[PDB]
């Protein structure tokens, strides 16, 4: 508790989305309103970890990746179409 007062006297943690990476441990990431940047990856993170269309913790000074933030929900997978129990006067001929 006593130490935090300076800790949250801190700023720079940007948030990004990776379109896709390329060679030399780099990626292509667009910012929320802004354009797309080619940046550096973190020593603790892996290139194979970088999946396209995923958020990443960004620096504000060097825009260095801090942590590949988890997706919310795969929207098609949250809107996954129903496979309910598949159990009509007028509709028998077309049957």
């Amino acid at each position: 508790l006593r130490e935090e007062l300076q800790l949250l006297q801190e700023q720079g943690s940007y948030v990004g989305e990776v379109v896709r990476a390329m060679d030399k441990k780099k990626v292509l990431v667009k910012v929320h309103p802004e354009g797309k940047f080619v940046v550096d990856v973190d020593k603790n993170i892996d290139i194979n970890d970088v999946t396209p269309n995923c958020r990443v913790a960004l620096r504000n000074d060097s825009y260095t990746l801090h942590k590949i933030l988890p997706n919310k929900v795969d929207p098609l997978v949250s809107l996954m179409m129903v496979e309910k129990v598949p159990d009509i006067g007028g509709l028998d001929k077309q049957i």
């Binding site: 354009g35 080619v38 940046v39």
Partner: protein, 387 residues
């Protein structure tokens, strides 16, 4: 890469042997003299020294910019993602050859200098219009065409395959080809056949799709079409169904029809107006042939007009045999019952027959084949034409 421009002998001239033997001994000499570098002093101060030095000279946050204009040698005008446009100089690090307007670029933070260039994507248009792979059957699928195949072959296939007849005389090949005849003839068959057995790119085009609710794109679609076909690679363009879209100026009216007149106009000048395209193969499909614009009909635009006849009883026995090749066949059937009876039935009709068998027999889930399958099938297609 452009090691020697001379190809002038075009033969086994001792000139050429002297040429390629000299170039050979030069290459060996270079490979050996450079070979004696890693022998006396094999060193590696030219991989990560220059690469690392410039990777640190240039920056991280590699802001992606957009080219606007090119001026002189080093300074150009760029545009940021929002519109802030800077008069920034470029480094001798990016390929100056692949640097044209309308291209993504890499910029610096402080000076915003052009650092690198981003390679372009594959445009959606190619994915939309180009038949990506060999779509359908090869030359085992023909019902019958020999003069057609000859014309299209020596017009396209023989030229590209063996380009040692046209540069002997300096005679260029014919440009345009009109494939016409009654419907259901197999125009799609031959087009997809040459597209199957081919070495250059292929494009398929429909004509009904050249009408926008927006006003006057049209020739936009045409010009971008031929632009992609030309810029992409050796291009084999194919447009089917130009008859219901480019016939003639029937009444010289307005309101959409005039728009189509403008569009086919742009397909005319764009077809061949100025500074001849080159490596631009063009092939056109039509059902009717008389209601066509003769300005497109004239030479320069189309040099081969091919008729599509309808065989009578000779190739039909192979058409029923192809459309019945991959199917059971009980001994109760004989193809001559229907092949030896008519003499104009289209291959589309043989297809509707040999498929109508697959509908009849297995609608009832009976055994392989019966002769009445071909009887009711042939009569059914008889009402398919007659009705």
């Amino acid at each position: 890469a452009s090691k020697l421009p001379l190809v002038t002998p075009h033969t086994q001239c001792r000139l050429k042997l002297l040429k390629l033997e000299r170039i050979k001994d030069y290459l060996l000499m270079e490979e050996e003299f450079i070979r004696n570098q890693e022998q006396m002093k094999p060193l590696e101060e030219k991989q990560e020294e220059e690469r690392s030095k410039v990777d640190d000279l240039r920056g991280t946050p590699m802001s992606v910019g957009t080219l606007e204009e090119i001026i002189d040698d080093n300074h150009a005008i760029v545009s940021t993602s929002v519109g802030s446009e800077h008069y920034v100089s470029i480094l001798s690090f990016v390929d100056k050859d692949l640097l044209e307007p309308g291209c993504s670029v890499l910029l610096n933070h402080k000076v915003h200098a052009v650092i690198g260039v981003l390679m372009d994507d594959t445009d959606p248009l190619v994915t939309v219009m180009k038949v990506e792979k060999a779509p359908q059957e090869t030359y085992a699928d023909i019902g019958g065409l020999d003069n057609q195949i000859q014309e299209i072959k020596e017009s396209v296939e023989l030229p590209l395959t063996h380009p040692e007849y046209y540069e002997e005389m300096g005679i260029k090949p014919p440009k345009g080809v009109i494939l016409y005849g009654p419907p259901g003839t197999g125009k799609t068959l031959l087009a997809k056949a040459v597209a199957n057995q081919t070495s250059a790119t292929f494009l398929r085009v429909v004509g009904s799709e050249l009408i926008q609710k927006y006003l006057g794109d049209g020739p936009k679609l045409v010009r971008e079409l031929f632009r992609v076909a030309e810029e992409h690679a050796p291009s084999i363009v194919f447009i089917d169904e130009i008859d219901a879209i480019g016939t003639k100026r029937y009444d010289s009216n307005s309101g959409g029809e005039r728009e189509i007149q403008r569009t086919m106009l742009e397909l005319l000048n764009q077809l061949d107006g100025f500074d001849s395209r080159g490596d631009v193969k063009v092939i056109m499909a039509t059902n009717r042939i008389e209601t066509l614009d003769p300005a497109l009909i004239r030479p320069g635009r189309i040099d081969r007009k091919i008729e599509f006849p309808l065989p009578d009883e000779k190739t039909k026995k192979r058409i029923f045999q192809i459309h019945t090749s991959r199917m059971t066949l009980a001994d109760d059937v004989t193809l001559d019952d229907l092949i030896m009876a008519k003499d104009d039935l289209s291959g589309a009709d043989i297809k509707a027959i040999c498929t109508e068998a697959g509908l009849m027999a297995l609608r009832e889930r009976r055994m392989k084949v019966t002769n009445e399958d071909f009887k009711k099938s042939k009569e059914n297609v008889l009402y398919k034409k007659q009705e």
